[PDB]
Amino acid sequence: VNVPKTRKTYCKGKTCRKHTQHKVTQYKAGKASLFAQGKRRYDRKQSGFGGQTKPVFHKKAKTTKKVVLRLECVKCKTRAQLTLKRCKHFELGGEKKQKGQALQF
Amino acid sequence: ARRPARCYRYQKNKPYPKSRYNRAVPDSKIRIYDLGKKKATVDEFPLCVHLVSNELEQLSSEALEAARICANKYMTTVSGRDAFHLRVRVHPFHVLRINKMLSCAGADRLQQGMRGAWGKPHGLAARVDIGQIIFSVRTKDSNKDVVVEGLRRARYKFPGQQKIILSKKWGFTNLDRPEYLKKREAGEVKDDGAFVKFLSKKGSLENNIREFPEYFA
Amino acid sequence: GKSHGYRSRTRYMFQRDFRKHGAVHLSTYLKVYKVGDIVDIKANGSIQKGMPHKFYQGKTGVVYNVTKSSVGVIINKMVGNRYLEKRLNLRVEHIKHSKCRQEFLERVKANAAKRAEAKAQGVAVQLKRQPAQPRESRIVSTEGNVPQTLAPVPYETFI
Amino acid sequence: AKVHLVAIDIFTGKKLEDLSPSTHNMEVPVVKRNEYQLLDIDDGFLSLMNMD
Amino acid sequence: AKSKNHTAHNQTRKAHRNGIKKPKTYKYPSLKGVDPKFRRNHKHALHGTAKALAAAKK
RNA sequence: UCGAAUUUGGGUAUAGGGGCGAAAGACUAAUCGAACCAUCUAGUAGCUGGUUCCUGCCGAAGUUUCCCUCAGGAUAGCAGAAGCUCGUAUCAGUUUUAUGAGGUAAAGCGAAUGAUUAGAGGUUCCGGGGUCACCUUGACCUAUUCUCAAACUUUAAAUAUGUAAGAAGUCCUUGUUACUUAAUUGAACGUGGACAUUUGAAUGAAGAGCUUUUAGUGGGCCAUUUUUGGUAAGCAGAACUGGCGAUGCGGGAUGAACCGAACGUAGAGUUAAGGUGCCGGAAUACACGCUCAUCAGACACCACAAAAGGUGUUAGU
RNA sequence: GUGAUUUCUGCCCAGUGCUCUGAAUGUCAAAGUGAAGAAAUUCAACCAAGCGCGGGUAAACGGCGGGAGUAACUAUGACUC
RNA sequence: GAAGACAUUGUCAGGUGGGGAGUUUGGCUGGGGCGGCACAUCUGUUAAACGAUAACGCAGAUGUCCUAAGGGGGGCUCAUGGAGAACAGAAAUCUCCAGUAGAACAAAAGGGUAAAAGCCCCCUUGAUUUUGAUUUUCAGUGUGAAUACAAACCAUGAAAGUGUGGCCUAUCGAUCCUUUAGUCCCUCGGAAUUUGAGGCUAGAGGUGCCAGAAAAGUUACCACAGGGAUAACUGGCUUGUGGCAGUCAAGCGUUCAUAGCGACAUUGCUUUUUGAUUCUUCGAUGUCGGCUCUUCCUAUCAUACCGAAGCAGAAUUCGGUAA
RNA sequence: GGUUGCGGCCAUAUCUACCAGAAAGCACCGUUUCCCGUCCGAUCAACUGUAGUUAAGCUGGUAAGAGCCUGACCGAGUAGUGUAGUGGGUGACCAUACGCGAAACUCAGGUGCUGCAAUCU
RNA sequence: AGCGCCGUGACGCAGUGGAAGCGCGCAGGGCUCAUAACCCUGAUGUCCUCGGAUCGAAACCGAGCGGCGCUACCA
RNA sequence: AGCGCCGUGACGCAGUAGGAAGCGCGCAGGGCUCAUAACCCUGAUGUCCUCGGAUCGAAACCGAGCGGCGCUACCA
RNA sequence: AAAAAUGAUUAA
Ligand SMILES: C[C@@H]1C[C@@H]([C@H](O)CC2CC(=O)NC(=O)C2)C(=O)[C@@H](C)C1
Ligand SMILES: [K+]
Ligand SMILES: [K+]
Ligand SMILES: [K+]
Ligand SMILES: [Mg+2]
Ligand SMILES: [Mg+2]
Ligand SMILES: [Mg+2]
Ligand SMILES: [Mg+2]
Ligand SMILES: [Mg+2]
Ligand SMILES: [Mg+2]
Numbered sequence A: 001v002n003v004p005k006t007r008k009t010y011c012k013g014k015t016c017r018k019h020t021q022h023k024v025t026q027y028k029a030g031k032a033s034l035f036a037q038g039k040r041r042y043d044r045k046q047s048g049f050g051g052q053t054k055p056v057f058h059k060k061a062k063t064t065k066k067v068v069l070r071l072e073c074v075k076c077k078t079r080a081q082l083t084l085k086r087c088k089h090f091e092l093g094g095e096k097k098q099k100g101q102a103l104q105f
Numbered sequence B: 001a002r003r004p005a006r007c008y009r010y011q012k013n014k015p016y017p018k019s020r021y022n023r024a025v026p027d028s029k030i031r032i033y034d035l036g037k038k039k040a041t042v043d044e045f046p047l048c049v050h051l052v053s054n055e056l057e058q059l060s061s062e063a064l065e066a067a068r069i070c071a072n073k074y075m076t077t078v079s080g081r082d083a084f085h086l087r088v089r090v091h092p093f094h095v096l097r098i099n100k101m102l103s104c105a106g107a108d109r110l111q112q113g114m115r116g117a118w119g120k121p122h123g124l125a126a127r128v129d130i131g132q133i134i135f136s137v138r139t140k141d142s143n144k145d146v147v148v149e150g151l152r153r154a155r156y157k158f159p160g161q162q163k164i165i166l167s168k169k170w171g172f173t174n175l176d177r178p179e180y181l182k183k184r185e186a187g188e189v190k191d192d193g194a195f196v197k198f199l200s201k202k203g204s205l206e207n208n209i210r211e212f213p214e215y216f217a
Numbered sequence C: 001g002k003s004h005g006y007r008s009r010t011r012y013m014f015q016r017d018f019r020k021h022g023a024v025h026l027s028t029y030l031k032v033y034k035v036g037d038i039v040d041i042k043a044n045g046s047i048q049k050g051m052p053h054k055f056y057q058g059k060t061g062v063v064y065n066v067t068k069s070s071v072g073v074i075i076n077k078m079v080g081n082r083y084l085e086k087r088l089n090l091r092v093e094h095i096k097h098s099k100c101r102q103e104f105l106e107r108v109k110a111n112a113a114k115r116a117e118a119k120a121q122g123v124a125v126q127l128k129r130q131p132a133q134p135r136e137s138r139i140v141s142t143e144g145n146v147p148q149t150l151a152p153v154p155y156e157t158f159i
Numbered sequence D: 001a002k003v004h005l006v007a008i009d010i011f012t013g014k015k016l017e018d019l020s021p022s023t024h025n026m027e028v029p030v031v032k033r034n035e036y037q038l039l040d041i042d043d044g045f046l047s048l049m050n051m052d
Numbered sequence E: 001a002k003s004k005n006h007t008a009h010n011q012t013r014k015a016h017r018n019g020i021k022k023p024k025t026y027k028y029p030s031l032k033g034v035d036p037k038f039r040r041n042h043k044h045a046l047h048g049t050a051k052a053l054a055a056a057k058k
Numbered sequence F: 001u002c003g004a005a006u007u008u009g010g011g012u013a014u015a016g017g018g019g020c021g022a023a024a025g026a027c028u029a030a031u032c033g034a035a036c037c038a039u040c041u042a043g044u045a046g047c048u049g050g051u052u053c054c055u056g057c058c059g060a061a062g063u064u065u066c067c068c069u070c071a072g073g074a075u076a077g078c079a080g081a082a083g084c085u086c087g088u089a090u091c092a093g094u095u096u097u098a099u100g101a102g103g104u105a106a107a108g109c110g111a112a113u114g115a116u117u118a119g120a121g122g123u124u125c126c127g128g129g130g131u132c133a134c135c136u137u138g139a140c141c142u143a144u145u146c147u148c149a150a151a152c153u154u155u156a157a158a159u160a161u162g163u164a165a166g167a168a169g170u171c172c173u174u175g176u177u178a179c180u181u182a183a184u185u186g187a188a189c190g191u192g193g194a195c196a197u198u199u200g201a202a203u204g205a206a207g208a209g210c211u212u213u214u215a216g217u218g219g220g221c222c223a224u225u226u227u228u229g230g231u232a233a234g235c236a237g238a239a240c241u242g243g244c245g246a247u248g249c250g251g252g253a254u255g256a257a258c259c260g261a262a263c264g265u266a267g268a269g270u271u272a273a274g275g276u277g278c279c280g281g282a283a284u285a286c287a288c289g290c291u292c293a294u295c296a297g298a299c300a301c302c303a304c305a306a307a308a309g310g311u312g313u314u315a316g317u
Numbered sequence G: 001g002u003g004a005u006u007u008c009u010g011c012c013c014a015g016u017g018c019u020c021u022g023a024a025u026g027u028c029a030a031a032g033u034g035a036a037g038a039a040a041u042u043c044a045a046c047c048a049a050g051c052g053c054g055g056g057u058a059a060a061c062g063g064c065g066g067g068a069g070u071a072a073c074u075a076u077g078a079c080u081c
Numbered sequence H: 001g002a003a004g005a006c007a008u009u010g011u012c013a014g015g016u017g018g019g020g021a022g023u024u025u026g027g028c029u030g031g032g033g034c035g036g037c038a039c040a041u042c043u044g045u046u047a048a049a050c051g052a053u054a055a056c057g058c059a060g061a062u063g064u065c066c067u068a069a070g071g072g073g074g075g076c077u078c079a080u081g082g083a084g085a086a087c088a089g090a091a092a093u094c095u096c097c098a099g100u101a102g103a104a105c106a107a108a109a110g111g112g113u114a115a116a117a118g119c120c121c122c123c124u125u126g127a128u129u130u131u132g133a134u135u136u137u138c139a140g141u142g143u144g145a146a147u148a149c150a151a152a153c154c155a156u157g158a159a160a161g162u163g164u165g166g167c168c169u170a171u172c173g174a175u176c177c178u179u180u181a182g183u184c185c186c187u188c189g190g191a192a193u194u195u196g197a198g199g200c201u202a203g204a205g206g207u208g209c210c211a212g213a214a215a216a217g218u219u220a221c222c223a224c225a226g227g228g229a230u231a232a233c234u235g236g237c238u239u240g241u242g243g244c245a246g247u248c249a250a251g252c253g254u255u256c257a258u259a260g261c262g263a264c265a266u267u268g269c270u271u272u273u274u275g276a277u278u279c280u281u282c283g284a285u286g287u288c289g290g291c292u293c294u295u296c297c298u299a300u301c302a303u304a305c306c307g308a309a310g311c312a313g314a315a316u317u318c319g320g321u322a323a
Numbered sequence I: 001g002g003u004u005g006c007g008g009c010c011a012u013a014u015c016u017a018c019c020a021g022a023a024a025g026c027a028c029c030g031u032u033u034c035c036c037g038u039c040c041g042a043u044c045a046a047c048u049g050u051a052g053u054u055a056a057g058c059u060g061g062u063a064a065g066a067g068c069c070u071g072a073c074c075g076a077g078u079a080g081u082g083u084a085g086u087g088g089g090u091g092a093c094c095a096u097a098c099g100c101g102a103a104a105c106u107c108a109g110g111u112g113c114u115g116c117a118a119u120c121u
Numbered sequence J: 001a002g003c004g005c006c007g008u009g010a011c012g013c014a015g016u017g018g019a020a021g022c023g024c025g026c027a028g029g030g031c032u033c034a035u036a037a038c039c040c041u042g043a044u045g046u047c048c049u050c051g052g053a054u055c056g057a058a059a060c061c062g063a064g065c066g067g068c069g070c071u072a073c074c075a
Numbered sequence K: 001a002g003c004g005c006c007g008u009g010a011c012g013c014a015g016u017a018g019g020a021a022g023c024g025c026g027c028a029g030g031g032c033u034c035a036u037a038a039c040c041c042u043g044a045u046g047u048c049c050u051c052g053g054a055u056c057g058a059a060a061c062c063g064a065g066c067g068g069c070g071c072u073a074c075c076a
Numbered sequence L: 001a002a003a004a005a006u007g008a009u010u011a012a
């Protein structure tokens, strides 16, 4: 799929509260960042004797992911998250379609 | 090596024609449906004799072929080929299925039983009911006994009950003989390939003169 | 596996009628529905918005809500051992007035008219409908109508 | 059932073997091949050009 | 060992044992699903007509 | 086999996931693919078996959805109990009237889409093997003709199915509003007034509504009809209804389900289904015919019969 | 491991295993080192063995192919692909 | 005498470690296993004209694709045929006529659509924010999908109007944990500041056994609880397959359908084969054959008496009564 | 009654061939400076209503016309079907009783009706 | 019975939805007295059939044909 | 015993989904050679195993026979 | 010290 890098959409930033211009990027997760409480609990539980203490997932079925769009207002820098359907190929702001063109083979 | 006809005698299933969902059907055994002087005109063979079914069943194409051969061969041997026209009036459109099993000692190691029992096409049958014409013969009045006994011989090739009916219609037309005579004495009948065309009060007038010209005189 | 989607088994009842395809005539859109009107549900297959589910084809209900292009229809649906109130949001394409309720309203006006006349003259106007009564006596004259008919007929081949 | 599998690495050319029950799942890569036109080859490192 | 898959046998007899009952309509049904603009109006119309009735009766 | 890798006493050593094994998973005190004794320990069991007095009243389920769910649970239903608010109704496994909805049965194919038999007449700048604008395998068109469809259809039943048949109604004024209209227009809700005892079809109503809480069940099976797979099946799988299970009684000799009819303890009468030669209660009744079998026949479910044939005999065309 | 004597014990080290090097590099723990921070801490470099890369080894585990043409009767195929 | 701050020993860290330990090794299923997916779904049919409806029924499809293939508006009309135009021909572009869709609309199938939902062009982001109500599956739970409003902000158009993704019917995912966005808010409990951590609202990372454990085999050395809910022997139903009989009569039999045969067809019977089924038996009915011994059946090989023959005789062949 | 503007039902309105059309209306029609749009003033834009024509559109008629619409004790109470019997038949199936009931077929008619507003030999 | 695979130039075989390639074989010329070797040059394919989807299939789908195989266990 | 197959010159092989047969060896005759062999050309050689059927027409389709090939043939 | 195989039968 192909989504533009720029998009006009509603911004609920308490100063816009209206359709403003947004910059579009893809959401990236970020580092798991140990010292999170779940990570501390997990390290404490895995210490000592007893083997593996938690489930280890194996039965992978999905091959794609949902794409999340990170929308940034250009007036107040407020951000918003939009979700798209599953896709295999995702690209941002590239190569708008040409309608009446010969096949390149 | 084909199953006896009692396995497929009755119309237990819905019709199962060759279609885009079936498309893997063997060819029917019967290919010829008109025999004798099939190009003969209507007025040449005023007499019609029918082999009317008396049971609601289905007739295999093998039986249709066998009775076709028997009736045609007898009538051709006795009164020649040009003395009659035989039209068989049922087509094997229903497909029979067989769930084929192994038939040897040791079949139990691989037999699979009644699982996935949907059968594959096995043969073709024509579905007929009470009073449905199977065979029709048109000939002259003087050739009545030959075609009657030929249809009697064809009867033994079919399962169940069948009657022999002398028609009161002129040949293969839907008209009685006296009314067909009344129509040729007028200008209401024009010859065609083997059948005829009729003149009506309806339609374009000038068309009804270019056809049937000798009427309106 | 089995398939039980929203529009399954609707092949023939979401057809348009033969030689009746195309656009909808404006009398569909000029009909006025009030709350309390009794309407019949029949989906127009050419309008895929506000379309009722296949269950409600042929059901008759009461309008409870009126919106811009749609009405809210209340239908009683038998689920198990009781009827559940079901509320539908249907565009007016799939909706027509119940003609039976139109004759009921006309009959109410006619009943009022009969009672109004009877209050002045001709008391005991006897409003209620009655079922088809047995016929009374009559004298069937034969003069010019002499009875004449034969017996059953013999069997003939006709083949 | 179990499946014994013998396969050659598509890059290193080495034989790999593995075995698994016939009804468990294994991964299959998303192997794709692409046409390119051969420009210069200087320090190895073939320089290639796409359909564009 | 396969068992029976499905049947609606005896289900109507069970349903009719305690009868199939209509949902007992009331006067003044709930305004759930009615248009909010209509509901907002109707609150003020009811308030005004009760005010007029109480003012007249005293 | 019998002079040695011999046989054997006594002593001694090796102890249980340990020993010992010229190897058999052998042996380790009648115990060995992990001894024996005691304890944890009344170990756990969705599995088998059992589960102790009487009478009275009511009275099932084998189905829905979810579950490493398929011999089990939860959930809803079916059942009981406690009742509560009222006192003939906001009702109904029914009909009528009115009004919808449907695409099956049937039908149709010289109507669409597919399938399909045979000729006829025209179209070769549409290729016909043929000689200078032709009968002579084709393909196309036109008018015909034979036969078809679970996944074709113009048409289109029967049965089943929705709704309405008023007081929470109808009509007349004029009130509310921030909704609506160009508007003092509507929308919805109202004040006041009018409508009489047929308050707006029929029949019935055994009291009508309402609530809490909890049992068992969650293997089903049979019959008529519809119906799928299968050569078929006392086969496997669905639909509606009635049954059996849970149920005796009369009849079908016998039999879960068929027919009749459902059950407190008795008496009398009358019947059902089925019968009335004798077993066996009840006409070896009456009447008109048919049948003679050196393998007659003799009551539905049901305990089978076919294609085919006969100057047997009877009736008939 | 094989199993008296006799006579033999062919070919295959790609896989699995076993074994032997290098420092030319990849992976790379704890401790130690450096840097940013107020500090917890974060980042980076260095980084043993093993792994990885590369040799050896079958009386280690084991393994030990298809198709086609071709001779002056055919048939077969010494030969050839 | 050797050896020496090295070894050793202690603690932590990486590797190796079936030698040993613990555990697991899905379900449905005409028994199980192998196969398949009928395990979450969608179209048509089965399905019996409301709705619902099963099978390892039938014919298929889904785990995607799309900044346009979404939204609005404008203009035009498609498949196909006929007649024509240099190269150009059956298929290149151009023109006219006919053309109810016989085209196209991402992708199965069904439905829908002609001044359009198709094709081309001009703008655009409504594929947005806040929640509630509703429909389908349904317990009237969730999830997925969808319908109609409300309050905003917008797009498009002259405007009515339309637009909360794809013309409709499929295209997907809880708890815990991690992560991001939002409010710049609440808490770290002796009082503050700053890091850090924890909360509230809303997305993502995934459970396809799709209401969502983290999971390899073998056992003929085997064990237990059970099951005739379920296979393997007998019996029962069926009789495809096996075996036997009939009807017809093309043809064979020098001449001649039927002395004897008898194709193509077709009607049966039997239970001595093999299957199908799963009703009886799993707190056990001893499971092949042979040997021994009795009896029964007849569909008769021989023997008795017969009829027929392409029966001179002989020898045969067909048939009746007959076990 | 004709015509026009907007329509309602959406073929009794459609289709094929031919004929006719006072008056008005509609239409064809003439032109490109302007607004606007094209490969092309052909469509669309604008101007004139003048220069011309009913040739075409449009409206009506004609046709043993095609289609479509309505009806018939035409087929036919046929096909189908609900209920019932210890009905018939070996069975497939069939009849009867109490009910409902087609579609093809044949024949006969018909071929737009109409609302608001303006105008007219 | 159920399931899987293969079919390409004369032969053995590759093959990326944009009309097919390696090795021999074959053909032409040369060298040799001649053949082979050798040298210089060319050519050879409804991709098993018949339909379908796609603008376009050798590849995808449906059938039909011909070969190769696998399962065949507890009784 | 069943279920599939196949049979084409003197010898082998090709048909194909019906409109009468091709190729290669062998034979004979020619061309080359002193004469041969090899080579080349040409010709002959198949009543498609027999019989029967359906068809306008069968080596191709159907049945029988004959011969050969391949697969299958209690049971615990 | 590069490579270099073959040549049908009979006929003083
Ligand atoms: C596969 C990974 C983890 C998974 C999930 O946290 C796994 C389990 C872990 C656990 O122990 N208890 C749970 O309740 C969930 C999840 O959410 C996915 C999106 C991402
Ligand atoms: K089941
Ligand atoms: K249907
Ligand atoms: K184990
Ligand atoms: Mg610790
Ligand atoms: Mg540790
Ligand atoms: Mg069936
Ligand atoms: Mg939509
Ligand atoms: Mg001795
Ligand atoms: Mg052992």
Ligand SMILES: [Mg+2]
Residues within 6 Å of the ligand: F031
């Ligand atoms: Mg012992």
Ligand SMILES: [Mg+2]
Residues within 6 Å of the ligand: none
């Ligand atoms: Mg009691």
Ligand SMILES: [Mg+2]
Residues within 6 Å of the ligand: none
């Ligand atoms: Mg009781």
Ligand SMILES: [Mg+2]
Residues within 6 Å of the ligand: F071
């Ligand atoms: Mg039990």
Ligand SMILES: [Mg+2]
Residues within 6 Å of the ligand: F219
């Ligand atoms: Mg149970």
Ligand SMILES: [Mg+2]
Residues within 6 Å of the ligand: none
């Ligand atoms: Mg019970």
Ligand SMILES: [Mg+2]
Residues within 6 Å of the ligand: F252
């Ligand atoms: Mg009895």
Ligand SMILES: [Mg+2]
Residues within 6 Å of the ligand: none
């Ligand atoms: Mg009864």
Ligand SMILES: [Mg+2]
Residues within 6 Å of the ligand: F280
């Ligand atoms: Mg007595």
Ligand SMILES: [Mg+2]
Residues within 6 Å of the ligand: none
């Ligand atoms: Mg040794």
Ligand SMILES: [Mg+2]
Residues within 6 Å of the ligand: none
């Ligand atoms: Mg060796």
Ligand SMILES: [Mg+2]
Residues within 6 Å of the ligand: none
């Ligand atoms: Mg470190």
Ligand SMILES: [Mg+2]
Residues within 6 Å of the ligand: none
């Ligand atoms: Mg081995």
Ligand SMILES: [Mg+2]
Residues within 6 Å of the ligand: none
């Ligand atoms: Mg272990």
Ligand SMILES: [Mg+2]
Residues within 6 Å of the ligand: none
């Ligand atoms: Mg299982």
Ligand SMILES: [Mg+2]
Residues within 6 Å of the ligand: none
């Ligand atoms: Mg599930």
